[PDB]
Each structure stands twice: as structure tokens, then as C-alpha cells.
Design a protein around this ligand. Sequence first.
Ligand SMILES: Cc1cc2nc3c(=O)[nH]c(=O)nc-3n(C[C@H](O)[C@H](O)[C@H](O)COP(=O)(O)O)c2cc1C
Ligand SMILES: O=C1C(=C2CCC(c3ccc(Cl)cc3)CC2)C(O)=C(O)c2ccccc21
Ligand SMILES: CCCCCCCCO[C@@H]1O[C@H](CO)[C@@H](O)[C@H](O)[C@H]1O
Ligand SMILES: O=C(O)c1cc(=O)[nH]c(=O)[nH]1
Length: 350
Amino acid sequence: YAEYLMPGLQRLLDPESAHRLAVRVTSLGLLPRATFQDSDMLEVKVLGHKFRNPVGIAAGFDKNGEAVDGLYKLGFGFVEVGSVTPQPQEGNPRPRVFRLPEDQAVINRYGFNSHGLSVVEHRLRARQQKQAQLTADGLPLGINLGKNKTSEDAAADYAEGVRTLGPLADYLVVNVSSQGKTELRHLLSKVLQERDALKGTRKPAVLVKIAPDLTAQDKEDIASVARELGIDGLIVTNTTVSRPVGLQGALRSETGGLSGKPLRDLSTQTIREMYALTQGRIPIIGVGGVSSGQDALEKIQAGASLVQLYTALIFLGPPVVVRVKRELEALLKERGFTTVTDAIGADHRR
Ligand SMILES: Cc1cc2nc3c(=O)[nH]c(=O)nc-3n(C[C@H](O)[C@H](O)[C@H](O)COP(=O)(O)O)c2cc1C
Ligand SMILES: O=C1C(=C2CCC(c3ccc(Cl)cc3)CC2)C(O)=C(O)c2ccccc21
Ligand SMILES: CCCCCCCCO[C@@H]1O[C@H](CO)[C@@H](O)[C@H](O)[C@H]1O
Ligand SMILES: O=C(O)c1cc(=O)[nH]c(=O)[nH]1
């Protein structure tokens, strides 16, 4: 009864309520488990790990690590636990989430509503053994670290997030996308330093997530600092504060970050630029408006080693995960790529 009923409920609910119900339904494992088997050609070895498939769920869906197993069960090659702030906080006042149906877009200004490190840490440790096996089987767990609203030292918040959740993550993410090149360098250096100070052999990779709203200078500074400090990767494109001419959703004037289709090509272009600026030496996780295997391939070809999607799940439902992987698989063969890895950065080989 999962499908059939869920599509209806979605239409009868405001976007935030629909979001919370989706997380619940997913954690309870009420959705059918994907039968699609990830072929060897979809495997990507990057960030010190193995990814059975290159399609993950972007940060922000499961902010509190409540539906991880259910997400892998849907077919995602990896999961990124939504932004986690040190202390719990409620985020911005409602309404803070809006659907733009006609544009297959969403606008949100959640404001980092989070359960906090203690809670998320408890949840993830309760399933650490299970995750250790999932990871070993090529299903990595990423954890996106955020900072509290009234926090003074952003770096201190991120570091606390590194010490607290780092032991449970395969990779960690720090947003600069939810000051000059100098403050960016110092903030990241402290994050990496905290990462290197973690106990154990398997040190999680550290990625920087950027918005698509960057000046020519911002892009060069990020590439330079990333290259200089030895950052492990870049997640390219959080939501955008721009509102493209031609948006038809009546709620387009609302403040917040725009995601979904309108962000698709802007995001890909940003991946192309960052890849070039870093000379293809820094793994990029492409994200933004991915709704088909075609969209994923465009991002991979522009420079992404892996991709993520979120908004498409909202307008196409859970079937979108397997659909993107299946199409991506057929498009790779059709275009002469024997494996996903061979397509990474393909547009840059000319
Ligand atoms: C409702 C909502 C909440 C989000 N929350 C987060 C978050 O907590 N942390 C983060 O790094 N990105 C967050 N994002 C951004 C997504 O991870 C992704 O970068 C962006 O939505 C573009 O992908 P998409 O077009 O496939 O949704 C959020 C996006 C949406 C739509
Ligand atoms: O997950 C959703 C959502 C959704 C409702 C339930 C859907 C669904 C549809 C069919 C099945 Cl079989 C399972 C889940 C998944 C998408 C929805 O409508 C939103 O508006 C939203 C806004 C922000 C963040 C997340 C979301
Ligand atoms: C037949 C199945 C009916 C399912 C009804 C789900 C109603 C969910 O309702 C939502 O719950 C959220 C918290 O859980 C609240 O924050 C939202 O304001 C509320 O609309
Ligand atoms: O919590 C949020 O508002 C948020 C964080 C982020 O990184 N991206 C986004 O679109 N929303």
C-alpha cells in the first residue's frame, strides 16, 4: 500500500509535512526495496571508498540520520546525513518550504533545523556495525556538518562536528554554501587538522560544499585553497538564491534556496568550471536538478565522480533512483564508456 497511497498524501500535504512523512515512511522501510542490481560498471572508487553506484541522496533529506538504511534500500549508492548542527535548533519560522510544481523546483529556507550532534551521534552509533558492513559492501555514509545560528566561531562548530561524528563517517562535508580567501583557508585548515587528529586508521575524507552563487574570484579562491590544503573533494552546488526569468511557480518570489530543474544546467556549468580550475585533481560530487540518467551523465562528463539528487525524488517519487541508475547505465554503454569511471571529466578531454 506504500505506493498508491503515498502519492496521494503528498498532494494533500504542505511540503514540509510531506518531507517529514517521507522521512518517517522511509525509515520504517515501508517503501519497496529496489530490486535493480548495481552492475560492476557503475562502481566508483573515490574518496578512499568504493561506491557500488554513483547516485546518492543529497544532504537535507535525512538531516538527522533517521532513514539511512531505508535510503540504501531505495537504491542510493551512498547517503549523506543532512546538515547536523552541534546543538539542536529549530531553524527559521514557517512557512519555510515551497513547491514550484510547474518548474519542478523547490525553494527552502529551513535554516538548519537539526536534532543536534548528541542525538544524531546516538542514532548513528546504534547502527555502526550495520554501517561498517554497508560501507564494506560499497555503500558509503557521508555526514554533512553545519553550524549553529547564533554561533561565533564557525570553525569551532565544524571541528566539534568532526570530533563527534567523524568516527562514524566515511566522508565529511562542510558548507560554505547554505570573509575572504584567508578566512576560508583558516576555517578549512582547522577542519582538516581536527580530522587528522581523529583516532584510528580509516580517516574520513573531507569535502567542501559550495553554492552556485559565486563570483569569478570566489571560484578561483575555492579551487586554490582546496588545491593548497589538500581537500579531498568538492560537492558542487547547494541551492541558489537566484530566481531565473521564466519561473512559473507562484511562490517564486519567496526567499531561500532554489533546487530542482531550474538549477540543473547552472549546477553542471559550475562543475565544469571547478573541475578545470582544479585541473581534474579534486573529486567532485555533482548535484543540482538531476532527474534522469541523462542529467547524471552530463554532470559526470562535466567532471563529477559521483552525483546526488534530492528534489527529483519529490516530483518523480522513489522510482527516480533506480530509473536514473538504469538510464545512466544504458547511456554509458550507448556512448562508448565501459564504466562510469571512464566518463568522469570526459568533456575536458579534447
Ligand atoms: C528542502 C531542502 C533541504 C536541504 N537541506 C540541506 C542541508 O541541510 N545541507 C546541505 O548541505 N544541503 C541541503 N540541501 C541542498 C541539497 O543537498 C542539494 O545541494 C540541492 O537541493 C540541489 O540538488 P537537487 O536539485 O537534486 O535538490 C537541501 C535542499 C532542499 C530542497
Ligand atoms: O520528500 C519530500 C516530498 C515527497 C512526498 C512523499 C513522496 C513519495 C511518493 C510515492 C512513494 Cl511510493 C513514496 C514517497 C516522496 C516525495 C514532498 O512532496 C515535498 O514537498 C518535500 C519538500 C522538501 C523536502 C522533502 C520533500
Ligand atoms: C492515512 C495516512 C495519514 C498520514 C497523516 C500524516 C500527517 C502528518 O502531518 C504533519 O506532521 C508533521 C510532524 O509529523 C507536522 O510538523 C506537520 O505540521 C503535519 O502537517
Ligand atoms: O537548512 C537549510 O535551510 C539549508 C541548508 C543548505 O545547506 N541548503 C539549503 O538549501 N537549505
